[PDB]
Design a protein around this nucleic acid. Sequence first.
RNA 1: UUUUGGCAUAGUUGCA
Lengths: 44, 240, 115, 77, 66, 526, 35, 98, 240, 254, 98
Amino acid sequence: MIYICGECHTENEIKSRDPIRCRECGYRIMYKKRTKRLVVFDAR
Amino acid sequence: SLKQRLKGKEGRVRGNLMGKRVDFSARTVITPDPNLSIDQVGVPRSIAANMTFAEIVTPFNIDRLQELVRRGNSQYPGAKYIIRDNGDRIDLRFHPKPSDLHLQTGYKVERHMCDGDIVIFNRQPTLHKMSMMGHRVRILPWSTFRLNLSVTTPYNADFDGDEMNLHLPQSLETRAEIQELAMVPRMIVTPQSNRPVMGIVQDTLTAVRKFTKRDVFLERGEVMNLLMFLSTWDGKVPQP
Amino acid sequence: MNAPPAFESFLLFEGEKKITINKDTKVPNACLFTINKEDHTLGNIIKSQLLKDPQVLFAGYKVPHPLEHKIIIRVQTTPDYSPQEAFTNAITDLISELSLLEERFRVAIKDKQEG
Amino acid sequence: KRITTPYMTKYERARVLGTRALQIAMCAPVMVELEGETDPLLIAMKELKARKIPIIIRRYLPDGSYEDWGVDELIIS
Amino acid sequence: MIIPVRCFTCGKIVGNKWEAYLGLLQAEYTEGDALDALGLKRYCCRRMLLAHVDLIEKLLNYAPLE
Amino acid sequence: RKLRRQMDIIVSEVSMIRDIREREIRIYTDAGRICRPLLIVEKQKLLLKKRHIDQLKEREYNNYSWQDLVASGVVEYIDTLEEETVMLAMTPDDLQEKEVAYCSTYTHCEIHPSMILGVCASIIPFPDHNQSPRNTYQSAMGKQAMGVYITNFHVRMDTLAHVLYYPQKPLVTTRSMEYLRFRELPAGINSIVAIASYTGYNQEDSVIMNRSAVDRGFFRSVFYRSYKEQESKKGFDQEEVFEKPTRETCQGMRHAIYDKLDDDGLIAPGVRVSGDDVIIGKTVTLPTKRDCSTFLRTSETGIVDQVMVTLNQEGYKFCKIRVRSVRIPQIGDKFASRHGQKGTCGIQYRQEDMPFTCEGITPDIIINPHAIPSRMTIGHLIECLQGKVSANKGEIGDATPFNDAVNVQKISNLLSDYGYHLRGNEVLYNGFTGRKITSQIFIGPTYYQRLKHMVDDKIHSRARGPIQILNRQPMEGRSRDGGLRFGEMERDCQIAHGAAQFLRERLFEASDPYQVHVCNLCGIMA
Amino acid sequence: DEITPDLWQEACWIVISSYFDEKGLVRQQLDSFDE
Amino acid sequence: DGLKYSLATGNWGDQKKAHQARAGVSQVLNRLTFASTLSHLRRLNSPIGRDGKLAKPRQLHNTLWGMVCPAETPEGHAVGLVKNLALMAYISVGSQPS
Amino acid sequence: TVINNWLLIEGHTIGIGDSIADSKTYQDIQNTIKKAKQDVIEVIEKAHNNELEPTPGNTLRQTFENQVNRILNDARDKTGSSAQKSLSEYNNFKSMVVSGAKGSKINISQVIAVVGQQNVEGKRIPFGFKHRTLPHFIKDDYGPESRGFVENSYLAGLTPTEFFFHAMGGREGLIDTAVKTAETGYIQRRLIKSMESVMVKYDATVRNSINQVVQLRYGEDGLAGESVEFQNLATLKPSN
Amino acid sequence: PYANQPTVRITELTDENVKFIIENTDLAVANSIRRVFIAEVPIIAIDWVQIDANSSVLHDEFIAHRLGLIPLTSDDIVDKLQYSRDCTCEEFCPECSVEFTLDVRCNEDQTRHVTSRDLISNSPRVIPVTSDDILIVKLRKGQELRLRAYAKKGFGKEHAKWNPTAGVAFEYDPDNALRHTVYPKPEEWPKSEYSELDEDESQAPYDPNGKPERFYYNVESCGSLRPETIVLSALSGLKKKLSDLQTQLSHEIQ
Amino acid sequence: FIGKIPIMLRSTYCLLNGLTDRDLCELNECPLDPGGYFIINGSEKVLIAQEKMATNTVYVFAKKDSKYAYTGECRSCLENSSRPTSTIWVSMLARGGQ
RNA sequence: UUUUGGCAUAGUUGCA
Ligand SMILES: [Mg+2]
Ligand SMILES: [Zn+2]
Ligand SMILES: [Zn+2]
Ligand SMILES: [Zn+2]
Ligand SMILES: [Zn+2]
């Protein structure tokens, strides 16, 4: 449930219930963190 | 209002009786293919695997349609549905039940469209008989309808981005009707001006103008290479 | 989407014969060799070597379709010499040619490096 | 007392072949000696060449009358 | 976006020459002289270095989202 | 005019027109009038002098700019109304020099004629050598061309976006491109194109392409599609919540998988998705609950690039999901020169199969020779020749339209110096047999543009599926699927065919079959 | 003194570059909105 | 909202009288390539009106020299009605005549 | 197949060298253009001195316009003919034109010699300004370049006035294409819906849905348009 | 009825290209040899890029595609290596692939150039050929690229990354004696570098009895293989193809 | 307070007014972006310049969709106020109808 | 354990 603030780039654990806001700058746009799944590309 | 519902271009009588959306129709971009006969149309594998034709089970094709039923939709060529004699419909992308995969005479298998199937091929606007013509399906491994170059000028088509439509007759009588009336070899001569509607076109026309010049001379290997591409060749090399 | 895999232009899938021979009934002593998963590389060279043979009355090849991977080689010969024999002899001639070319290229490399 | 043409029209050929191919697809008896023929359309074409199709064309004249032509009676183009 | 690795036509390696090309241009070389110094004789290879627009330098102005 | 040219009480945009024949002086000051700057001419001499050019050369670190040029009374804005009372010189170099007189009283002089063109028409190299319908077609196609539409595309989330991997500024360029920022944001690639008939897949305005070049990223592109969605609360009628729908708690679903999503009902970035996978798990409460989650479009496929979550205007949580999809050129993708030479990829050949020069150069693209003659796009050929000269010389060529310092003779003489045929032809070898092609092929670099109309975005087929709710016929929704209208034209075409059975099958059996029960005595559906 | 024809080709494009440096391409929209 | 709706939908005039309102004034900006963005921002639309029926406006007139592009217009049923400004063309912003 | 495979040995192209004529041809074309401009100036001087007399049925403006139009037309086709004579046998423009694959002789003349008169609604370029076609001419100037006779070939490139007048000429082509498409189908749909029910009945008469005799035999002969063909009656023209 | 006796003459041999001449051969053999240079010489190129972390401005497929195009030194290892599809493993064992590891974190403010130098191989015989180095990507402060990729044996027919040649110049009949090409104006055409005419002729006199021969080659290597190695491997591969075809033909006849 | 006016980007009142390219990059705004458009609900909206007939000017035409030989139109409009424009015509009756 | 869906507009764009 970790997001990254769009302005200050702070990792925030935000639950699905509470509103979304940066916990040290107040910015209101959050980007999900990159998936930890296994990703592979053929180099073609 | 009710009066507005029937009047106009998009009314019920002019938008939903004279014309209407039809099942079993595909559309995509056209590209040239000199290696196809004029009665052949290239078809992408995905369109062929999405489209189906109802083949009635007979003792002659029982084994073949059983194999296609075994393949299912996941593998091309296969089938989508089995319509039994009772009219109940068995889907093949969800049912692994081997009892449901039994076939008998009178059953219908909606097999995937395969090579040699007859398809009406249309280009909007449809301005004459030759704007819709019958072609034989040839499965080729890319995402466009490949066409012979000679069939472009009846359709008034060029491969500048133009799209074309493909309707699949779903019944044997309709398939025979398209075979005997609407196939493009039967449509070579138009009744509009009692002449061929299609002739030889840009590259091959310039090249055959240059080829039949008096001073074109071909050595032994060259003519042997060219005679490979002559389908009607009797196999006798002419005297030079 | 419908793009074929790149590997299926030189790889034979399960239950596919590399080469198939069929007699041509139109003309005596004529055969058609359909070789799958090949291209002009073998077609043109085999055609040329067959044309070098004096007993070969006809030798030609074609790719039926570029998107497909087949070469059909038609070989007609004199009545006292089979097309299969001519085809095998042509391939052995090409193999000997390329082996000799390998040896001479190695010798040339050694002379140029020493020089 | 037949006034219509003795030639099968292209439309008559189309509909006759279509219906007979459908009938062959429903396991109808086949009136021609086939040899490894599986497609119903090819079998119907073989029947038409043999003039063995058991169908009668009812051509309606434009006055309510009609004429019944056997497929064998007509001239195949 | 960034210099391509290969020449599109012939496949010659070009990605290891953009910085050298710019360095030669800072040394007051004509662009033909720079490409000749880098050893690109075929005009297919010369076209790529001559016509490349390096937008990654502009994309790096924006701070990363981390 | 003295006051206007000095920026006195009259401002520049005020336009004064004297109708001498009707004895009227109309002064206009309102908005909406169109005008352009013209250099003032007095006694057959430009008021512009070398001093102004020297000051403008040091435009930086001098604070001398265009506004000082207007203030000096050298250049003034003339509107189309006042143009009727203006005798205008096309170029000062010849039109006002002493000679056998045509007109000795010139009031103004154009800055450069090439500025009559707009934005999309000014990227055309040598437009004055083309047929004007093809100039119009290119003006449309440059709008449709792929490229880096903006430098900050990474943060933006537009519904559709196309970005080319390796765009290049044109080798043959116009001066006006310097001010459009086309040099900074080019849209296209310089391609070694050979105008030749070949195996036959380039015919009828199509293109053969080099497969190996595409394998090297030639015209490779990326397509970004962003899906937005918001959870709402409408009183207590219902409530949408972002969460992955579990197979037990919601009675309404689709067969697509729901494990791609995370606990918050959103898919993480860096995960492949097919055309039916779910990306935003959203559940609407049932007055259990139901799902209204969104899926990718049926034909689409790609990797989730970016995932932003924020509060909308009302303060409800809502997210936007950018999906990356790498598009490689294939058969059917459109390409176009800067001359209206529109064409689709007929077929792709490997490098060995392509024809090659004596120096191993294979063309990236082959176009049909017959695309030229009815077109009369001679600017395309001149672009190819000038691009060859530019690539050999190592200098970006100039293709300003109305420039007499450059012509085909000078370009050919320059090309002959580099050991090439002066007209750009070359001896090409057949890639299959290795034999020399008899005629010598016209080959060279040319700027090509990939248009946004890929084949994968315009291929669709139907067997059966989402019919209408009213007409009970196929309809379009969730994709291009929904059948094609068998319009009046197709109906009458099949009537001309006499194909009554096929026409009935199209219009009745395979569009919307139905059956009703009607009384025999009366005629109303019982 | 005056611009010779050989140097006019450079001079005119210097003038046009100065124009686009001062004004830009969207003076229409911005000036209308500011007014 | 009143500006917003009119800029959101492109229907100009009174909102409740949108039946007789001029449509298509405001359009979503075409972000496909930078040239397309610039071309869209420098765009003139000529409505049909009663006036356009009296004299044919689609044709390229002489006064369009230097003010709009001579060769740039969408095909179909929009030729000559949608135009693009010339490069140096500048539209008067208006001033007081006092 | 055969011609496309032989063309790999032959090959066919189009390039700058195919659009280039010798210096003598250019000098001849320039001499023709100078002569045409001089005689246009003589016609203008005759008109200004009231020496030109109107032809029967035409006003003086029409007489002058006809004279200058025929003058420029004969100059254009003479230049095109002279350019055509300059073409070599290897010239690819000529190869594509003589084969009929693409283009025309007018295309070669316009590419090589003279693009020719640009016309708007079947007349020369009108005076949009006050008695002027553009701000770069003097009032009451009826010369060739003033009224939109472009003299440079596409190879030579058009001047600014010539380019703008050519854009004007092509705008009518685009607009008439648009209105043709606007009228596509409308006439055709009206015709078919008048005539869709007409059919050859089995008594060989042609009748409509309501079974009214339209023709006692189709085409007044009972023959289809497929298999008819042009012949010459051998007894009509010869004398007794 | 038998093979020609082809003769080789190497004109030039550098570390980046080889120029040579083959006489006493038909056109088809020479053309197929050039074709095999381009499309049938196996080399080792990067495939199967697994990205653990990529916060660079270029998306993941872009980086993988750039990595695939990096040539790798495969002079002597490729012959004893096996195609991964034929190997009996998890598709990556040392007998059918070579592991590569990239792990770059840009901490300094200055722009960090991720070049081919940063590709660490697990086998010393296989490295990037430049190890200026091929730029993969430029990174900003705080950006990171971290991935592991492998390199399999393949040839240019499958994908152009495995093409070892940087342009194969091929020529024959430099004076146009056979008239396989017909110049409309032969005086206008420059002499080829192998031409033997004086500066008053434009073509050699026509030879009706002539046949193509004395084919001039210039094979330029991208770097993954030495040019002499490219030619030797090419001839070996074509001979192997013909021998396998003979084997299948014999099996079909029997 | 009376409302909210949408602000054209890079105008004199947009926050990107007169900012150097660096600051535009810090705000993740493209320095090459020309602006000239509004943002309405996140959508970039551009107003196409509407062509219309000039006002306060006498224009004499010769209609023959009516009974007048000639007609002098004048779309008179107030300056800066009272947007409803009053169109007066002064026509000459055709002498043919008698 | 077998679903699915907003109608009507307006604009833009492709091919004929
Ligand atoms: Mg088209
Ligand atoms: Zn923050
Ligand atoms: Zn190169
Ligand atoms: Zn009843
Ligand atoms: Zn292994």
